[PDB]
Amino acid sequence: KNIDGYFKIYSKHTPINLVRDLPQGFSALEPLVDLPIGINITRFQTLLA
Amino acid sequence: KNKCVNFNFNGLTGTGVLTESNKKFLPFQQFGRDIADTTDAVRDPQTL
Ligand SMILES: *[C@@H]1O[C@H](CO)[C@@H](O)[C@H](O)[C@H]1NC(C)=O
């Protein structure tokens, strides 16, 4: 998310046993870094290996 | 600590008794608040 020229990222990494789709449970997301980029962003891509 | 003092921490001006809080703040989380929404606790910007 980006609001008022300030980008916000929220990262949580926990181990889980999952096959496909998504498990039903609760999680509390916490911030990762602070990036005052201040740029228009209309699109995004997901890099893969 | 343990005395009534006027403190300005990270541009936040306030007056109150400063004590060591047992609550564990996240590294990013700084200003704590009570039910009244007034600031419950802060973080020293010099020595965290
Ligand atoms: C970002 O650029 C796109 C394409 O020019 C435009 O449609 C959109 O309104 C712009 N958003 C902002 C916040 O300027």
From Swiss-Prot, chain B:
Domain of life: Viruses
Effect of T13K: In strain: Omicron/BA.1
Biological role: Attaches the virion to the cell membrane by interacting with host receptor, initiating the infection. The major receptor is host ACE2. When S2/S2' has been cleaved, binding to the receptor triggers direct fusion at the cell membrane. When S2/S2' has not been cleaved, binding to the receptor results in internalization of the virus by endocytosis using host TFRC and GRM2 and leading to fusion of the virion membrane with the host endosomal membrane. Alternatively, may use NRP1/NRP2 and integrin as entry receptors.
Quaternary structure and interacting proteins, as annotated: Binds to host ACE2. RBD also interacts with the N-linked glycan on 'Asn-90' of ACE2. Cleavage of S generates a polybasic C-terminal sequence on S1 that binds to host Neuropilin-1 (NRP1) and Neuropilin-2 (NRP2) receptors. Interacts with host integrin alpha-5/beta-1 (ITGA5:ITGB1) and with ACE2 in complex with integrin alpha-5/beta-1 (ITGA5:ITGB1). May interact via cytoplasmic c-terminus with M protein. May interact (via N-terminus) with host bilirubin and biliverdin, thereby preventing antibody binding to the SARS-CoV-2 spike NTD via an allosteric mechanism.
Protein name stated in the entry: Spike protein S1
